[PDB]
Design a protein around this ligand. Structure first.
Ligand SMILES: [Mg+2]
Ligand SMILES: [Zn+2]
Lengths: 1316, 653
RNA sequence: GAUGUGUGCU
DNA sequence: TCTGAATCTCTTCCAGCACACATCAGGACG
DNA sequence: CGTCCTTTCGGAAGAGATTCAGA
């Protein structure tokens, strides 16, 4: 069964496999994040609650005073979204936090308080997010791009290769906190372990182990496992565990209890170890001189005198053995330092360590952190204690603690946010484990290491930064307390919070000006994962391995939609089905596969929970319960695709689209495009400008009805109902009573957004797609947005292409467009642009907007009205006067050069005390009127309902319906009726009616007061005047056109209709593209889309024939059914028998331009089916017809490929790029021509073009390029005079920018001069 | 500078100059008050740091920041770097009398013509227009003429069509990598806003027409016009200065046209008839009485200049097609006939142009290149040489080859299970058999494409090289290769991981079938490798070419002969196999250093100081010498220059 | 006018 | 215990062009 | 308003500066 905007034009679907999970809400990473930041959470995580609870209650220096947080609340904005966009102010909501200040008494640390007091203090006005994930910051629409960075935790990297030039790989454990200091540990080419705090400079890691209050004995206890030597009757045999004998050579005769086992020098085979385990012999004889290479673990003092014989960590020799034996040190503990497995790293590090005790190490750390300062006890102690051990300056967040406890194989994921001694020691232990040979480093680009930090975070962060500034100021201001009088607002200052929030939302690196020139552009701007920004990497210093597409990108990030040039793969785009884990890592869906059955329950697997499983590919043929048709199927196990048995798999991709983004999934026949051309297709399809008259794609993908609905441009029903009144600028839905609330039943009204200006100076303009008296159900479009067609994305037009060379007018990539494509005004676009004129109060008196303009003809002042501003509707051109402004000595606002238009909206703002001008209130009287036109509609419908209730009361209990309507609607209450609770309800209705009139009056007055406010401007100006010209840009030789397959071009001609190639019916081709564009850049998708467009337009032409020479509905029904069934095993299955003989006639009437065809991305049509569909029309199955030359009338002696390609008009217009300049204004300090096209500026003869003039030898062209038409001010006007004197000759001088250099060098202490 | 408002825009120099006078006059006060030694010491240190920040900010410990927490720009920072005075205002600069726009094709121009919008020529040449609205008396002063042009009367045209007549304009394309990226064309005024740009200069410019823009500059003075005409005119540049190779090479549609025309089909509309000249060949093709690919006997008269520069004719009766005789009407007088009596690919017509240049000079070649262009365009359009889906023909043996290779990888898997082969051996064997399978599919599809068309030869039946469209535009070198035609109809091959290690299961499809969801993810690895590469590569080739231009930057040819008996020993380079470069290329156009002794030893074959040339290299090849002492630039004895003999041929002239 | 940010195009 | 060779800091540079926006000492006491 | 005030995804040379290990 189909929706109500579906049995209206239903798109044929060639997809072959069912969709077990439907495309989620597309832009849901923005709305979920903000709804989490702004929400009311009692558990205090995460959100604003988390920020407050993490800063408050804030106490003074134990001054028996404390300011505690009670709650918070978000007031209503003083505007709505549209009024904020119009005025030029943020759409923000004030933040009222209910605080409390409690002060304890003298000798009352836990006792009663002297005074308790509380209030709600306004702190900060935090911007809110619109219904579409955008923010309105200063009247503009912005998008806070999600960020992809390193999740806090421990990361063991290696830096393989490129250090020490010996090919010896180092290793390093970096501990990244969510906020705090870094704690790198790294190895040295001599295998010494150095710590490095905040990247500053190495110093042996045992310095920090000592700073944690550890003695060398305890350190060697921690890191080394001990070998035990025993003083005994003689020869001092050693405690041995056979495992340590793995993989070395015999130092002596290994024997046990007198029997020989291993001979001198022989490599101890594992056989010797296992047989020794069979004998279970631990105490082994040892030569006393072999111990000469070992290191003692624990310090050894004498027993009689107590003098240290050998401290921890010093080698052994026969003399030390003698000193120990004469004392009687029956136990010796040395360090097992294999040369291979258990290397002696901490020993050597201790040998390099200069410090000895705890305080020495603390002082060394202080001398490394704050250089040049004489250390102290307290200074070094407090510094090292605040480095990683204070909740106020360090924070492994929940995520850092989780990744930490996970990378060390600990069990619990919760824990403390600050470090501890065991954390640091275990980090070092795992580092040394990696160095030994067990364990492995982790990559840095695996999508299990990179988080996603979207808007509900970073905003909490900046708010918390502002909050710590506030709490510092309060802590200060709370110690100087003039108590008994301080309300909890004399100390709270909302300048830090508001400044931080404004500086984050308004001017940051992830807070971008929205990309708004079709639905796809903004809906794929909101789902953009930027690796750049504050806290991430940079374009220039980003390697080749950040750009590449890791194998864990499958299903989490698009591989083929990322910009080109400087940042490729730094600006990835979220995939279609991809979600964000509760921690931030990207997770994607996967149908679980039970014993052999592909179940229908889906799990959202992140990137680390996917290298464990073996996941069946997205297209693997099931049989009616989910059994793969074959026994070995393609899958991907651990970032490595391969074949697997049918029974080993345990997940399967949900859809075939889930690998691509939403821009890359609008490309029909993507699987035939080379990924380079598909990348270009995605992008250019994102740049297409909305044309004058939207037009569905004949060859779609089925993802258009989602992209064009989930992006918001369109006016979508909130509650089902029946359309009651449809105007060009409002829709009124009478809600089904099944969906009305108990009280105040009524209707709901949708005010469409008529011709208004988008950020890119284009027209965003809704128009109704419903008709009067027609049912709608929930969530189906009522009005179409810019560049949608019946609630279905439509970025360009379907034009009839012929792939052939045509006299070299489509030579390289060019395009030869017919003249009918520009007669039909089908690529004509609309572009509005606001011009501004501000009246500032300069010196000699302010500047007013009067029309009294001196030294102007009357043709200039002809268009201005009396007030001085132009008439709404005046077709202006280049140079005309738009606003008249006077300078007390004339700075009127005039139309820029060459920009035509028609003035559609003049718009005046004024501060307060400046009275008005007749124009200024006769503007905005229209807003008064148009708000009355809504309030009055509500009032009429509600009073009609009320009087209907009155009459329905007067039809029961003595009906009088004949004489009720005679007397006016006023006194219908006290006719013949009883005095029961029904008459009580009549009196309640009278009082409700009076209350209604009163409340409508008061709400209209509220509207008029919000309208007639004062809208304070920027200081220094009195009144602003904005004038909106509206332009129509027609296609013309020069501006780009594109297809969805990366086949772009530049119109090189608009050929007459009679010169285009025509077929055997005289129908001229609309566009002529080059064939040689297809083979090299292997975007075959455009050719198959051409053939499928021809099939679809053949179907449409058959319907147009069957429907022009009017035929009974039976034939239409049967043919459209034959078109919708069409052959293969598909899932479409439409049944026209359940269409109402009138909803099939409208279906056919919508299919007469061509049946739209869908082709899901990697699940598309096949040539068997394209050719079958061509046969269902009456077109040649080869897709190629025999074209005739338009201008010589003879055949192209070959059949050419003619079809219907969906072309887009990228908004790189040519009348936005053509610029020329002879002389204009020149810069100020370096007297060169100005830059750019707005300033009438000149092209930059760069540094590389000078070398191309030096190469030619052209020494006079170069001299005139850098002297006369450029710096040299004295010989630059002599040239103007010579030129307009009949002379062409230069008297060149010295470039006034060399004298600037001489002065800037001579303004250092450097005497530079010219000789003679 | 006063920003918008009463305020004053920040200037970092004024911030530093105020920070200096503060930790100044204040210190002067303290030295007047005779304050204690330590406070004055700290004030002197603050003065020292203020001066060190004023002169070179940041060379200290921490660069001071004025606002926005960004180190403010000192004196030594407006002198150095890409934004300094040197590289920004004093080595290249913005320029008057110039503009830019988008380039379109214009296949009707001649090599020396560009097409300027009629609205961009009226803005560049504005003073030139005033100087004739004032000289014709059509105006009187500069204000009359200024408004006369502003309202674009119908007389500030052809005045403009005359200030434009023989006044070249330079046309520069954005990265001017070499010097052919600035060439001076004569303007043709066109209606529109796009700068129409002759097709044969796109190669030099490296300019497709997918949306890139050009910049016109106007040579004002008179010597600049004679330089733009005698040095930079796009006609004077038909050889590349980097090597003696041509740079006006017809490409990609002029060659698919000249290939489709000059080609034979073994049967046709008229395959027997004996024509009577090229004109009758055209009269027959145009009437539809013969096929452009027929096999006729034409009677052609070809000129040859075997005399001392004198052209003598020879009329013979050649076996050709109708197309190769229609095309002989544009080939100038002097070139042989077996220059068009083949099937012209890209190399054949680039060699036809390159031999016209060396036999007949420069003017016949500049006229011949336009004729080749127009007549390749005409007969490529006239052929409808399209591309469909039935043209990428999959071999009938692709299924069998791939099944065989699959069975073999399964067999090697069985060998690995039993443990007769380790991991690396298994991997390498699987890679090898999949590479052999890819090769077999490639050969199958290529045989199927090339020799395909079988046609009845008016007898029984016969094979002939095919007229497949995608094969024609691959074989003619027009636009295509074998790797690509093989990724379209053969199999797509073995794709490599991002690090470089080949994935041991190849993409076994192509873009005529479809790629899987996983075969298409495997492809993006090496698709984005080679895009991140070309984005990180321009910023690194530009820096190298800049350091190279700045090292040399002044090697002007300041003498005519230094008289040296030094030189290098040019010998054919050989690494162990085929000759990488013959002696003829490594010694051409250079001046010998010692008289080369013929292997008739003790007889001088060549003198001591002869620039060689083509023919002297031929003569070195006859007597088969294999080591020539040649005068190189690295041995010249001039000072601050290089003698013209120790350099040799100009390579462009 | 300077700087920064961002997008895009080559 | 005087000295050439191997490590350690810190300097400098990293393709060209067009177009949107933002911010301009501002913080604070008088 | 006027007016006074103070962090950390780089690779080469080359120039200290040390270390060293050596007679
Ligand atoms: Mg291009
Ligand atoms: Zn010389």
């Amino acid at each position: 069964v189909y929706s109500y905007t579906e049995k209206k034009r239903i798109r044929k679907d060639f997809g072959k496999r069912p969709q077990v999970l439907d495309v989620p809400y597309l832009l849901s990473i923005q709305l979920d994040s903000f709804q989490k930041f702004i929400e009311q959470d009692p558990e205090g995580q995460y959100g604003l609650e988390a920020a407050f609870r993490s800063v408050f209650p804030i106490q003074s220096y134990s001054g028996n005073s404390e300011l505690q947080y009670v709650s918070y609340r978000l007031g209503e904005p003083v505007f709505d979204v549209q009024e904020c966009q119009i005025r030029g102010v943020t759409y923000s909501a004030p933040l009222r936090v209910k605080l409390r200040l409690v002060i304890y008494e003298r000798e009352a640390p836990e006792g009663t308080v002297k005074d308790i007091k509380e209030q709600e203090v306004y702190m900060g006005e935090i911007p809110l997010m619109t219904d579409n994930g955008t923010f309105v910051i200063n009247g503009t629409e912005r998008v806070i791009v999600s960020q992809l960075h390193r999740s806090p935790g421990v990361f063991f990297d290696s830096d393989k290769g490129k250090t020490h030039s010996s090919g010896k790989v180092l290793y390093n454990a970096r501990i990244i906190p969510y906020r705090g200091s870094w704690l790198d540990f790294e190895f040295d080419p001599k295998d010494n372990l150095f710590v490095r705090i905040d990247r500053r400079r190495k110093l042996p890691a045992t310095i920090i182990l000592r700073a944690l209050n550890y003695t060398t004995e305890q350190i060697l206890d921690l890191f080394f496992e001990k070998v035990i030597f025993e003083i005994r009757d003689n020869k001092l045999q050693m405690e041995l565990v056979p495992e340590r004998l793995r993989g070395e050579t015999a130092s002596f005769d290994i024997e046990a209890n007198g029997k020989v086992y291993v001979e001198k020098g022989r490599r101890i085979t594992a056989r010797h170890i296992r047989q020794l385990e069979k004998d279970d012999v631990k105490l082994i004889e040892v030569p006393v001189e072999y111990i000469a290479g070992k290191v003692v673990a624990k310090d050894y003092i004498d027993e009689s005198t107590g003098e240290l014989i050998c401290a921890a960590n010093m080698e052994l020799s026969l003399d030390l053995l003698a000193k120990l034996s004469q004392s009687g040190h029956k136990r010796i503990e040395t360090l097992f330092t294999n040369d291979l497995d258990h290397g002696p790293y901490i020993s050597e590090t201790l040998r390099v360590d200069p410090t000895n005790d705890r305080l020495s190490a603390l002082v060394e750390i202080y001398r490394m952190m704050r250089p040049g300062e004489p250390p102290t006890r307290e200074a070094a102690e407090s510094l090292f204690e605040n480095l990683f051990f204070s909740e106020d300056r360090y924070d492994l967040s929940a995520v850092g603690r989780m990744k930490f406890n996970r990378s060390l194989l600990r069990e619990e994921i919760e824990g403390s946010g600050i470090l501890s001694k065991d954390d640091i020691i275990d980090v070092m232990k795992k580092l040394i484990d990696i160095r030994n040979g067990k364990g492995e480093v982790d990559d840095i680009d695996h999508l299990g290491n990179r988080r996603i930090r979207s808007v509900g975070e970073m905003a909490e962060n900046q708010f918390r930064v502002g909050l710590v500034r506030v709490e510092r100021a309060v802590k200060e201001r709370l110690s100087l307390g003039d108590l008994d009088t301080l309300m909890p607002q004399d100390m709270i200052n909302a300048k830090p919070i508001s400044a931080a929030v404004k500086e984050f939302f308004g001017s940051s690196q992830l807070s971008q000006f929205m990309d708004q020139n079709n639905p796809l552009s903004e809906i794929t701007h909101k789902r953009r994962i930027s690796a750049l920004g504050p806290g991430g990497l940079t374009r220039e210093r980003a390697g080749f391995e950040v750009r590449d597409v890791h194998p864990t990108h499958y299903g989490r990030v698009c591989p083929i939609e990322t910009p080109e040039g400087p940042n490729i793969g730094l600006i990835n785009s979220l995939s279609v089905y991809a979600q964000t884990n509760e921690y931030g890592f990207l997770e994607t869906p996967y149908r679980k596969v039970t014993d052999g059955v592909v179940t229908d329950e889906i799990h959202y697997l992140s990137a680390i929970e996917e290298g464990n499983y073996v996941i069946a590919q997205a297209n693997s043929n099931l049989d009616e319960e989910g059994h793969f048709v074959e026994d070995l199927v393609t899958c991907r196990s651990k970032g490595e695709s391969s074949l697997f048995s049918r029974d080993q798999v345990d997940y399967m991709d949900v859809s075939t689209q889930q690998v691509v983004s939403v821009g890359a999934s609008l490309i029909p026949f993507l699987e035939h495009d080379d990924a380079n051309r598909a990348l270009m297709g995605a992008n250019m399809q994102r740049q297409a400008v909305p044309t004058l008259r939207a037009d569905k794609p004949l060859v779609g993908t089925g993802m258009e009805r989602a992209v064009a609905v989930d992006s918001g441009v369109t006016a979508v029903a909130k509650r089902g109902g029946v359309v009651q009144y449809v105007d060009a600028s409002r829709i009124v839905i009478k809600v089904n009573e099944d969906e009305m609330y108990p009280g105040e039943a009524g209707i709901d009204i949708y005010n469409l957004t008529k011709y208004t200006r988008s950020n890119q100076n284009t027209c965003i303009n809704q128009m109704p797609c419903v008709s009067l008296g027609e049912p709608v159900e929930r969530g189906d479009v009522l009005a179409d947005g810019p560049s949608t067609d019946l609630g279905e994305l439509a970025l360009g037009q379907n034009m009839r292409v012929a792939f052939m060379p045509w006299n070299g007018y489509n030579f390289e990539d060019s395009i030869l467009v017919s003249e009918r494509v520009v007669q039909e005004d089908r690529f004509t676009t609309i572009h509005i642009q606001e011009l501004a004129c501000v009246s500032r109060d300069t010196k000699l008196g302010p500047e007013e907007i009067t029309a009294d303009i001196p030294n102007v003809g009357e043709a200039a002042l002809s268009k201005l009205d009396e007030s001085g501003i132009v008439y709404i509707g005046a077709e202006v051109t280049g140079g005309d006067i738009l606003v008249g402004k006077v300078t007390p000595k004339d700075s009127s606002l005039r139309v820029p050069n060459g920009v035509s238009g028609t003035v559609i909206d003049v718009q005046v703002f004024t501060r307060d005390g400046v009275e008005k001008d007749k124009r200024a209130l006769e503007i905005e009287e229209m807003q008064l009127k148009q708000a009355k036109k809504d309030l009055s509609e509500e009032l009429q419908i509600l009073e009609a309902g009320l009087f209907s209730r009155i009459r329905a009361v007067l039809v029961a209990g003595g009906v009088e319906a004949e004489k009720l309507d005679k007397l006016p609607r006023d006194r219908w209450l006290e006719l013949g009726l009883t005095d029961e609770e029904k008459q009580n309800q009549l009196e309640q209705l009278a009082e409700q009616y009076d209350e209604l009139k009163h409340e409508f009056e008061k709400k209209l007055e509220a509207k008029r007061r919000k309208i007639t406010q004062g809208d304070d401007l920027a200081p220094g100006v009195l009144k602003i005047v904005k004038v909106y010209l509206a332009v129509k840009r027609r296609i013309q030789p020069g501006d780009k056109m594109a297809g969805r397959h990366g086949n772009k071009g530049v119109i090189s001609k608009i050929n007459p209709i009679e010169d285009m190639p025509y077929d055997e019916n005289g129908t001229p081709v609309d566009i002529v593209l080059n064939p040689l564009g297809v083979p090299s850049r292997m975007n075959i998708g455009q050719i198959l889309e051409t053939h499928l467009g021809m099939a679809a337009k053949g179907i449409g032409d058959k319907i147009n024939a069957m429907l022009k020479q009017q035929q009974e509905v039976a034939k239409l029904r049967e043919f459209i059914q034959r078109a919708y069934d069409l052959g293969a095993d598909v899932r479409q299955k439409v049944d026209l028998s359940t269409f109402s003989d009138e909803e099939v006639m409208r279906l056919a009437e919508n299919l007469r331009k061509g049946m739209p065809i869908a082709t899901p991305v990697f699940d598309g049509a096949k040539e068997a089916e394209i050719k079958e569909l061509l046969k269902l029309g009456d077109l040649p199955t080869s897709g190629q017809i025999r074209l005739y030359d338009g201008r010589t009338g003879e055949q192209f002696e070959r059949p050419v490929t003619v079809g219907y390609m969906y072309m887009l008009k990228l908004n790189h217009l040519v009348d936005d790029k053509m610029h020329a300049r002879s002389t204009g204004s020149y810069s100020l300090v370096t007297q060169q021509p100005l830059g750019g096209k707005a300033q009438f500026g000149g092209q930059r003869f760069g540094e590389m073009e000078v070398w191309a003039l030096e190469a030619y030898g052209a020494a006079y062209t170069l001299q005139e390029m850098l002297t006369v038409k450029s710096d040299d001010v004295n010989g630059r006007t002599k040239m103007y005079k010579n030129i307009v004197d009949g002379n062409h000759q230069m008297e060149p001088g010295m470039p006034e920018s060399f004298n600037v250099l001489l002065k800037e060098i001579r303004s250092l202490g450097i005497n530079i001069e010219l000789e003679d | 500078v006063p920003l918008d408002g009463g305020r004053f825009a920040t200037s970092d120099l004024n911030d530093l100059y105020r920070r200096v006078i503060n930790r100044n006059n204040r210190l002067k006060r303290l030295l007047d008050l005779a304050a204690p030694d330590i406070i004055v010491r700290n004030e002197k240190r603050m003065l020292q740091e203020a001066v060190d920040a004023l002169l070179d900010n940041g060379r200290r410990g921490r660069a001071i920041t004025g606002s926005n927490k960004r180190p403010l720009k000192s004196l030594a920072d407006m002198i150095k770097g890409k934004q300094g005075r040197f590289r920004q205002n004093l080595l290249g600069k913005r320029v008057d009398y110039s503009g830019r726009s988008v380039i379109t094709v214009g296949p009707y121009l001649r090599l020396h013509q560009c097409g300027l919008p009629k609205k961009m020529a009226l803005e560049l040449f504005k003073p030139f227009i005033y100087g004739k609205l004032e000289l014709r008396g059509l105006a009187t002063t500069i204000k009359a003429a200024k408004k006369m042009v502003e309202r674009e009367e119908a007389v500030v045209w052809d005045i403009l069509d005359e200030v434009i007549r023989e006044h070249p304009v330079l046309l520069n394309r954005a990265p001017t990598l070499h010097r052919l990226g600035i060439q001076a064309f004569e303007p043709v005024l066109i209606e529109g806003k796009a700068i129409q740009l002759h097709p044969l200069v796109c190669a030099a410019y490296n300019a497709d027409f997918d949306g890139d823009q050009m910049a016109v500059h106007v040579p004002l003075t008179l010597e600049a016009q004679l330089e733009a005409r005698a040095l930079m005119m796009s006609t004077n540049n038909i050889l590349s200065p980097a090597n003696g190779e041509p740079i006006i090479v017809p490409s990609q549609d002029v060659v698919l046209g000249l290939y489709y025309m000059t080609r034979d089909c073994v049967n046709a509309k008229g395959e027997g008839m004996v024509l009577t000249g090229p004109k009758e060949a055209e009269r027959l093709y145009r009437s539809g009485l013969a096929s452009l690919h027929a096999r006729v006997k034409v009677r052609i008269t070809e000129y040859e200049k075997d005399a001392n520069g004198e052209l003598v004719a020879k009329t013979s009766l050649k076996d050709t097609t109708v197309g190769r005789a229609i095309l002989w009407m544009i080939v100038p007088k002097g070139l042989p006939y077996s220059i068009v009596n083949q099937a012209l690919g890209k190399k054949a017509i680039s060699k036809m142009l390159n031999t016209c240049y060396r036999i007949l000079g420069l003017k016949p070649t500049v006229i011949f290149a336009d004729q080749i262009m127009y007549t390749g365009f005409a007969y490529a359009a006239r052929s409808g040489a399209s591309v469909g889906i039935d043209d990428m023909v999959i071999p009938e043996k692709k299924h069998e080859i791939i099944s065989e290779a699959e069975a073999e990888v399964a067999e090697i898997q069985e060998q690995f299970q039993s443990g007769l082969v380790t991991a690396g051996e298994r991997y390498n064997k699987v890679i090898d058999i999949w590479a052999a399978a890819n090769d077999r599919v490639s050969k199958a599809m290529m045989d199927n494409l090339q020799t395909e068309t079988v046609i009845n030869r008016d007898g029984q039946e016969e094979k002939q090289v095919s007229f497949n469209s995608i094969y024609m535009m691959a074989d003619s070198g027009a636009r295509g290769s074998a790797a690509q035609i093989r990724q379209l109809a053969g199999m797509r091959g073995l794709m490599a991981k991002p690090d470089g290690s080949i994935i041991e299961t190849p993409i076994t499809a192509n873009f005529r079938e479809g790629l899987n969801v996983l075969q298409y993810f495997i492809s993006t690895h090496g698709a984005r490798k080679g895009l991140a590469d070309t984005a990180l590569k321009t910023a690194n080739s530009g820096y190298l070419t800049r350091r190279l231009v700045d090292v040399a930057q002044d090697l002007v040819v300041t003498e005519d002969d230094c008289g040296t008996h030094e030189g290098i020993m040019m010998t054919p380079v050989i690494e162990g196999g085929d000759v990488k470069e013959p002696l003829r290329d490594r010694v051409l156009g250079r001046v010998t250093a010692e008289d080369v002794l013929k292997p008739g030893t003790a007889d001088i074959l060549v003198p001591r100081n002869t620039l060689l040339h083509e023919q002297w290299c031929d003569l070195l090849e006859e007597n088969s010498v294999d080591a020539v002492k040649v005068r190189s630039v690295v041995s010249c004895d001039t000072d601050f220059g290089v003698c013209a003999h120790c350099y040799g041929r100009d390579l462009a002239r």
